[PDB]
Enzyme design. Structure first.
Site, PDB file in Angstrom:
ATOM      1  N   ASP A  81      -1.857   7.452 -14.048  1.00 39.76           N
ATOM      2  CA  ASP A  81      -1.648   7.684 -12.604  1.00 39.76           C
ATOM      3  C   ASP A  81      -1.197   9.125 -12.479  1.00 39.76           C
ATOM      4  O   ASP A  81      -0.038   9.417 -12.736  1.00 39.76           O
ATOM      5  CB  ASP A  81      -0.569   6.749 -12.055  1.00 39.76           C
ATOM      6  CG  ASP A  81      -0.605   6.622 -10.547  1.00 39.76           C
ATOM      7  OD1 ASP A  81      -1.527   7.209  -9.942  1.00 39.76           O
ATOM      8  OD2 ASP A  81       0.283   5.923  -9.999  1.00 39.76           O
ATOM      9  N   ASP A 181       2.304  -2.455  -7.485  1.00 42.09           N
ATOM     10  CA  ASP A 181       1.823  -1.064  -7.388  1.00 42.09           C
ATOM     11  C   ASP A 181       1.923  -0.571  -5.942  1.00 42.09           C
ATOM     12  O   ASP A 181       1.364  -1.218  -5.061  1.00 42.09           O
ATOM     13  CB  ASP A 181       0.362  -0.999  -7.854  1.00 42.09           C
ATOM     14  CG  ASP A 181      -0.043   0.373  -8.378  1.00 42.09           C
ATOM     15  OD1 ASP A 181       0.573   1.380  -8.021  1.00 42.09           O
ATOM     16  OD2 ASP A 181      -1.012   0.446  -9.153  1.00 42.09           O
TER      17      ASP A 181
HETATM   18  C1  LIG Z   1      -4.698   5.512  -5.662  1.00 42.67           C
HETATM   19  C2  LIG Z   1      -3.579   5.636  -5.038  1.00 42.67           C
HETATM   20  C3  LIG Z   1      -2.208   5.744  -5.570  1.00 42.67           C
HETATM   21  C4  LIG Z   1      -1.058   5.821  -4.865  1.00 42.67           C
HETATM   22  C5  LIG Z   1      -0.891   5.794  -3.406  1.00 42.67           C
HETATM   23  C6  LIG Z   1       0.052   5.894  -5.861  1.00 42.67           C
HETATM   24  C7  LIG Z   1       1.360   6.009  -5.537  1.00 42.67           C
HETATM   25  C8  LIG Z   1       2.555   6.003  -6.397  1.00 42.67           C
HETATM   26  N1  LIG Z   1       2.652   5.640  -7.676  1.00 42.67           N
HETATM   27  C9  LIG Z   1       3.967   5.782  -8.060  1.00 42.67           C
HETATM   28  C10 LIG Z   1       4.547   5.535  -9.278  1.00 42.67           C
HETATM   29  C11 LIG Z   1       4.108   5.079 -10.519  1.00 42.67           C
HETATM   30  N2  LIG Z   1       2.800   4.733 -10.983  1.00 42.67           N
HETATM   31  C12 LIG Z   1       2.901   4.351 -12.260  1.00 42.67           C
HETATM   32  C13 LIG Z   1       1.855   3.898 -13.110  1.00 42.67           C
HETATM   33  C14 LIG Z   1       0.603   3.507 -12.762  1.00 42.67           C
HETATM   34  N3  LIG Z   1       0.233   3.071 -11.522  1.00 42.67           N
HETATM   35  C15 LIG Z   1      -1.088   2.690 -11.538  1.00 42.67           C
HETATM   36  O1  LIG Z   1      -1.751   2.270 -10.588  1.00 42.67           O
HETATM   37  C16 LIG Z   1      -1.587   2.879 -12.936  1.00 42.67           C
HETATM   38  C17 LIG Z   1      -2.962   2.636 -13.433  1.00 42.67           C
HETATM   39  C18 LIG Z   1      -0.551   3.330 -13.695  1.00 42.67           C
HETATM   40  C19 LIG Z   1      -0.682   3.672 -15.152  1.00 42.67           C
HETATM   41  C20 LIG Z   1       0.043   4.322 -15.969  1.00 42.67           C
HETATM   42  C21 LIG Z   1       4.325   4.377 -12.646  1.00 42.67           C
HETATM   43  C22 LIG Z   1       4.908   3.998 -13.963  1.00 42.67           C
HETATM   44  C23 LIG Z   1       5.020   4.833 -11.572  1.00 42.67           C
HETATM   45  C24 LIG Z   1       6.548   5.061 -11.378  1.00 42.67           C
HETATM   46  C25 LIG Z   1       6.885   6.524 -11.525  1.00 42.67           C
HETATM   47  C26 LIG Z   1       8.290   6.827 -11.107  1.00 42.67           C
HETATM   48  O2  LIG Z   1       9.049   5.873 -10.792  1.00 42.67           O
HETATM   49  O3  LIG Z   1       8.587   8.040 -11.047  1.00 42.67           O
HETATM   50  C27 LIG Z   1       4.715   6.232  -6.942  1.00 42.67           C
HETATM   51  C28 LIG Z   1       6.230   6.524  -6.915  1.00 42.67           C
HETATM   52  C29 LIG Z   1       6.456   7.974  -7.365  1.00 42.67           C
HETATM   53  C30 LIG Z   1       7.908   8.346  -7.336  1.00 42.67           C
HETATM   54  O4  LIG Z   1       8.578   7.958  -6.343  1.00 42.67           O
HETATM   55  O5  LIG Z   1       8.341   9.029  -8.301  1.00 42.67           O
HETATM   56  C31 LIG Z   1       3.836   6.360  -5.896  1.00 42.67           C
HETATM   57  C32 LIG Z   1       4.125   6.819  -4.504  1.00 42.67           C
HETATM   58  N4  LIG Z   1      -0.511   5.887  -7.147  1.00 42.67           N
HETATM   59  C33 LIG Z   1      -1.859   5.802  -6.987  1.00 42.67           C
HETATM   60  O6  LIG Z   1      -2.672   5.781  -7.909  1.00 42.67           O
END
Ligand SMILES: C=CC1=C(C)/C(=C/c2[nH]c(/C=C3N=C(/C=C4\NC(=O)C(C)=C4C=C)C(C)=C\3CCC(=O)O)c(CCC(=O)O)c2C)NC1=O
Length: 208
Positions: A81, A181
């Site tokens: 992501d 998600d």
């Molecule tokens: C297409 C649209 C799309 C949107 C809108 C999106 C949003 C999104 N993903 C996030 C986190 C995240 N996303 C992931 C992981 C994934 N998530 C997945 O869909 C996959 C395949 C993984 C694979 C590794 C993780 C672990 C977090 C948390 C990151 C964090 O808390 O900083 C966050 C929180 C970021 C933060 O506040 O630090 C948002 C807003 N991701 C997207 O792909």
């Protein structure tokens, strides 16, 4: 033009067998459209599918891709992501995402992570979950590490050679990701609720 171009290149340089089998969507959206979605399905040797979403608008550039290997060798997916939210802020996430619920997966030699808002660590995310925050001009500082994760994944594919096509292996995984998600907010806003629903359920996490 995408800030993720070197990550994308590295992925397909590692797995050149992953060719487009279906273009699931090319959508316009956002402001009057300034947002564009491309959702591709790729297939190839030892993979059930690689499903690749790329959303771009004036402020953001999101590349969301999971490699679902063929079943039969208990291999994790490889997930990423890569989210640019503004000119000032990006988050890079990539990981080995194991389909078994509450099962700790790791690759000794890789960096180990350290709590996050939305998901459950150790549950379809590995001990080596890689999460970083930075400026857009800084993303390639982590490319070499990404390439190491790719190398380890290619090693597991090449050494185990899975051939199974049991999509139900991924049901618990796709169910968990659908539930947790935070994609719905961004998607509804830019594309509408029916498109949001379809994108999550029929493209991103369709093996439920
Ligand atoms: C297409 C649209 C799309 C949107 C809108 C999106 C949003 C999104 N993903 C996030 C986190 C995240 N996303 C992931 C992981 C994934 N998530 C997945 O869909 C996959 C395949 C993984 C694979 C590794 C993780 C672990 C977090 C948390 C990151 C964090 O808390 O900083 C966050 C929180 C970021 C933060 O506040 O630090 C948002 C807003 N991701 C997207 O792909």
């Amino acid at each position: 033009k995408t800030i993720w171009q070197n990550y994308i290149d590295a992925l397909f340089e590692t797995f050149p067998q992953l060719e487009i089998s279906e273009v699931w969507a090319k959508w316009d959206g956002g402001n009057v459209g300034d947002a564009k979605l491309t959702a591709n399905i790729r297939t190839g040797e030892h993979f059930l599918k690689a499903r690749e979403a790329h959303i771009v608008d004036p402020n953001s550039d999101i590349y969301n891709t999971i490699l679902y290997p063929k079943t039969g060798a208990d291999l994790p997916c490889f997930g990423m992501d890569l989210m640019k939210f503004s000119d000032k802020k990006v988050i890079i996430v990539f990981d080995f995402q194991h389909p078994r619920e509450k099962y700790l997966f790791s690759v000794d030699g890789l960096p180990e992570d350290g709590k996050y808002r939305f998901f459950e660590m150790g549950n379809h995310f590995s001990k080596n979950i890689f999460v970083r925050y930075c400026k857009p001009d800084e993303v390639d500082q982590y490319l070499d590490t990404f390439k190491l994760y790719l190398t380890k994944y290619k090693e597991m594919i090449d050494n185990n050679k899975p051939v199974g096509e049991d999509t139900t292996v991924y049901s618990d995984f796709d169910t968990y990701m659908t539930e947790l998600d935070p994609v719905r907010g961004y998607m509804k806003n830019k594309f509408g609720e029916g498109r949001s629903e379809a994108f999550v359920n029929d493209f991103l996490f369709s093996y439920k």
